[PDB]
Amino acid sequence: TVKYTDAQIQRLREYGNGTYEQKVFEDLASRDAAFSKEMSVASTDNEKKIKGMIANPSRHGLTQLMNDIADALVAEGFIEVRTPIFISKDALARMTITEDKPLFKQVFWIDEKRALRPMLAPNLYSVMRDLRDHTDGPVKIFEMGSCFRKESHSGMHLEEFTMLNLVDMGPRGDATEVLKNYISVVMKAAGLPDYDLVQEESDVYKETIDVEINGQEVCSAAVGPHYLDAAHDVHEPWSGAGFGLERLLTIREKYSTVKKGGASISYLNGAKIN
Amino acid sequence: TVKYTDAQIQRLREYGNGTYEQKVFEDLASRDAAFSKEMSVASTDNEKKIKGMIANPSRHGLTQLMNDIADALVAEGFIEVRTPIFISKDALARMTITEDLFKQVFWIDEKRALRPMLAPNLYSVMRDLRDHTDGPVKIFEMGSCFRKESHSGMHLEEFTMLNLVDMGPRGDATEVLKNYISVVMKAAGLPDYDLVQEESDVYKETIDVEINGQEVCSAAVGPHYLDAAHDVHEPWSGAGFGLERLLTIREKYSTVKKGGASISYLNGAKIN
């Protein structure tokens, strides 16, 4: 008739990758006793993976997820681009991310005119637009890299996160299905073949497609055009999708928090090192 | 006899990836006709290269170099680690980066900064993995580091560092470190280079790698006085590479701003 405390659930989540909020116990002593033993099982499992990685080293799991998805997108006809982390204050204004907007509060500022990017759309707007001068068919590009948002104002757990942004500028009568095929290629290559797409009409985009793997947002897609296009010299429909890569890796490997599979000095491929 | 003007030289490297400083011309008309010819050819080749990327897309040239090197390092037994871009003010102080290099640091707030090098985080990860093995501790990281152009001598403010460390004693540590450098340079497509082994007052030895006079890798055999501040107390050897600098030399790009992350360039071609 007692459950793990919130502090105990957190501590179990930081060290183990099982599920713990379901357990129930006769009294406080039995709960604390089973708490320490669940912590003991979590510590052994921790060392077992670290010794495994030390004995059989490999590419980082986040790196391997990026490579698995990226090679899939290239076979789909996408150019991989890399763009700087730094973006300009004018660049944030073209997204209507301005002082009066709440989203403005999450931005890390480098100086008075430059900032860390909170998303991949600014630079990808620039690149797809410039390639339009060099081709008449669809412009298909994508990037994977770190984006940065302050935690207090965005209410999410990672300040540095790796976004995957793919986009295909060009008109399509079948823009929806073509976009849904882009979602499939990513999710398949990511190892998450089952997912629920939330197709929805909108006033701002032509269409919007969220995706959920049992109740959790893992990608946000849309069919253009959008009112942000004209500020970027974009005057045609498009289709794009955005995936948080640490979140996908967390869900595929069933880690307890999102801070275990990505970039860290306390975790390494799900295991806690310190 | 005349050469290209400085304005002609800078514009030639804008779209062109040839070599132009050495050209010599009899007169102004001959110098101007050749400049226009190189312009039109650089622009024409630039256009064909972009359309080729559209016809047959591939992984980014910086990503492909990172993959070619990282697989060769995993085959040598290295663990690939990834660490945050943000480091603490204390971690910088433990590198003796204090107010008295400190002006190269991009400060995020009162206590956090963009990492100017991979050493502080790699220090913490190698130490923690020591509690988990008696054998050598071998890791590497490829990721962005940041430095202010106004104080750093380099032209990129964001640059991709590769750092590898092998913690733990070993016989002939310097020659093993030389092999680690050889695996990287061979995996990068740069087999021709010159090493500069030197006696050191701060390290046990220092290895500098140069190609055509340009430093491309800074390596060292430990220990070093910064080790105690990070609770490291055993031998180690490490090497650091700038990956845009490697890609520029291999592809013979006219500047070091065409191969890396950019919104003006894409794999050596200018898209504006």
UniProtKB/TrEMBL annotation, chain A:
GO terms of molecular function: metal ion binding; pyrrolysyl-tRNA synthetase activity
NCBIfam families assigned to the protein according to its UniProt record, in alphabetical order: PylS_Cterm
EC number assigned by the record: 6.1.1.26
Binding site for Mg(2+) 1: 68
Start and end residues of each Aminoacyl-transfer RNA synthetases class-II family profile domain: 63-165
Any one Pfam family match given in the protein's UniProt record, by short name: tRNA_synthFbeta
Transmembrane segments: none
Gene source species: Methanomethylophilus alvi (strain Mx1201)
Assigned keywords, A-Z: Aminoacyl-tRNA synthetase, Ligase, Metal-binding
SUPFAM superfamilies: Class II aaRS and biotin synthetases (SSF55681)
Annotated positions binding Mg(2+) 2: 210, 217, 220
Gene3D superfamilies in alphabetical order: Bira Bifunctional Protein, Domain 2 (3.30.930.10)
The keyword Kinase appears for this protein: no
Protein name (record): Pyrrolysyl-tRNA synthetase
InterPro entries: aa-tRNA-synth_II, aa-tRNA-synth_II/BPL/LPL, PheRS_beta_core, Pyrrolysyl-tRNA_ligase_C
TrEMBL record, chain B:
Entry EC no(s): 6.1.1.26
GO terms, molecular function: metal ion binding; pyrrolysyl-tRNA synthetase activity
Domain called Aminoacyl-transfer RNA synthetases class-II family profile: residue spans: 63-163
Positions of transmembrane segments: none
Keyword Aminoacyl-tRNA synthetase: yes
PROSITE patterns: AA_TRNA_LIGASE_II
Keywords: Aminoacyl-tRNA synthetase, Ligase, Metal-binding
Residues the entry annotates as binding Mg(2+) 1: 68
Alphabetized Pfam families for the sequence: tRNA_synthFbeta (PF17759)
Gene3D superfamilies found in the cross-reference section: Bira Bifunctional Protein, Domain 2 (3.30.930.10)
Binding of Mg(2+) 2, residues: 208, 215, 218
Keyword field contains Calcium: no
Top enzyme category: ligase
Name of the featured protein: Pyrrolysyl-tRNA synthetase
